[PDB]
C-alpha cells in the first residue's frame, strides 16, 4: 500500500564536527573512582559527521545516530542488505504505544512511512513478508536530543540510547555523557545498509525539516574515568594527538 | 642494529673539557677560595 511521489525532497547534508559524542558503557561491571583503559569500536573524537536538514546509507562497522528532535517526528529504522523479501531484513517501529521489532523478509516500495489520520489509524510501510523468525515488543524508546548507538557484533545487535534536554540551537552540544545499554538482540544478520522512517501528516505529506546527525564507528582505544557513583564522566581518545 | 639503540650523552665532550678548564684555571688563580 504505497504510491510514488513527485516532490523529490532532498536534505542538504552538511558536515559538522563530532566533538565528544558517542561514548557508551562497554561492559556490565560496576566500577567506581577508577581510570580504566579499553579498546573497542567507538566514534573518534573531533571527526566530521553528516547532518541532514530518505537515502540509503551503508552501515559499516557501527552507526552513531542523533536527533535533537522536537515533538518526536522520527519513527523507525530499517536495516539489511537489499531491503526486499528475498533477503532477511530488520525493522524497528516506535509509535505512541509499545515499541515493536521484527526480523523479516519484508517487501518495501520506494518510500515507506506510517502516516497519521486526524483517531490515528494509518500504517502502510511495507507490502508483503513471506517467512521470518524473531519478533519482539517492549516499552517505547522515546527540544530533546536523543542519541543511539547501533552495533552488530558476534550475532548480537546491541542498541544503546540516551536522552538529554537540549536548548542549543543547531550544533551538536559541547557536552559529554555516556550512553547506557538499552537492548540486545540475539540474532545475526548481514547488516550493511539502513534507512530511516518518519511520521507525515497524511490528510498531503508535510515533513521536510527532518534534521538528524549520522556518523560511522572505527576501532580505537579510550581511557575512561569513573567517579564515586560509577558514572562514566570523562574520556580520553588515544590515537588523536601526541598529548592524547 | 637489531632493535637496540644507543643514546648520546647529554654533555658533549667539548662541554666536559670546558668544565675541566674552568676548574683548573680557578684553582690556579684563586686557590680553594673559589669553592
Amino acid at each position: 500500500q504505497c504510491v510514488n511521489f513527485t516532490n523529490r525532497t532532498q536534505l542538504p547534508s552538511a558536515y559538522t564536527n563530532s566533538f565528544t559524542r558517542g561514548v557508551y558503557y562497554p561492559d556490565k561491571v560496576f566500577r567506581s573512582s577508577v581510570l580504566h583503559s579499553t579498546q573497542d569500536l567507538f566514534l573518534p573524537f573531533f571527526s566530521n559527521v553528516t547532518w541532514f536538514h530518505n537515502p540509503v546509507l551503508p552501515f559499516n562497522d557501527g552507526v552513531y545516530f542523533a536527533s535533537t528532535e522536537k515533538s518526536n517526528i522520527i519513527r523507525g529504522w530499517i536495516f539489511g542488505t537489499t531491503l526486499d523479501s528475498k533477503t532477511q531484513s530488520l525493522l524497528i517501529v516506535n509509535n505512541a504505544t509499545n515499541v515493536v521489532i521484527k526480523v523479516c523478509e519484508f517487501q518495501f516500495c520506494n518510500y515507506p512511512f506510517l502516516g497519521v489520520y486526524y483517531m490515528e489509524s494509518e500504517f502502510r510501510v511495507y507490502s508483503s513478508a513471506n517467512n521470518c523468525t524473531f519478533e519482539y515488543v517492549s516499552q517505547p524508546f522515546l527540544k530533546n536530543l536523543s542519541e543511539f548507538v547501533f552495533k552488530n557484533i558476534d550475532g548480537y545487535f546491541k542498541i544503546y540510547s540516551k536522552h538529554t534536554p537540549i536548548n542549543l540551537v543547531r550544533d551538536l552540544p559541547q557536552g559529554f555523557s555516556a550512553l547506557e545499554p538499552l537492548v540486545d538482540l540475539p540474532i545475526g544478520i548481514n547488516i550493511t545498509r539502513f534507512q530511516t522512517l518518519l511520521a507525515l501528516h497524511r490528510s498531503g505529506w508535510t515533513a521536510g525539516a527532518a534534521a538528524y546527525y549520522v556518523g560511522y564507528l572505527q576501532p580505537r582505544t579510550f581511557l575512561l574515568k569513573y567517579n564515586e557513583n560509577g558514572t562514566i564522566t570523562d574520556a580520553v581518545d588515544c590515537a588523536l594527538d601526541p598529548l592524547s | 642494529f637489531n632493535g637496540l639503540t644507543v643514546l648520546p650523552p647529554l654533555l658533549t665532550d667539548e662541554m666536559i673539557a670546558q668544565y675541566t678548564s674552568a676548574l683548573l684555571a680557578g684553582t690556579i688563580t684563586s686557590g680553594w677560595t673559589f669553592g
Binding site: - | 647529554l10 674552568a22 673559589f34
Partner: protein, 49 residues
C-alpha cells in the same frame, strides 16, 4: 623478540606487561648516568679563564 611478525605479537600479548616493566629500568639507568656526570663535573657556578 618477534622481529616484525603479527602472530608472534599476538602470542606475546598474553604475557602481560613484561616489556613496560623491562623498559622502565633502562630509562632509570640512563637518567642515572646523566646525573652521575653532572654531579661529578658541574661543581662550579661560573666559567673562569
Amino acid at each position: 623478540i618477534c622481529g616484525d611478525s603479527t602472530e608472534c605479537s599476538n602470542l606475546l600479548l598474553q604475557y602481560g606487561s613484561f616489556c613496560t616493566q623491562l623498559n622502565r629500568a633502562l630509562t632509570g639507568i640512563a637518567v642515572e648516568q646523566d646525573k652521575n656526570t653532572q654531579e661529578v663535573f658541574a661543581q662550579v657556578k661560573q666559567i673562569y679563564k
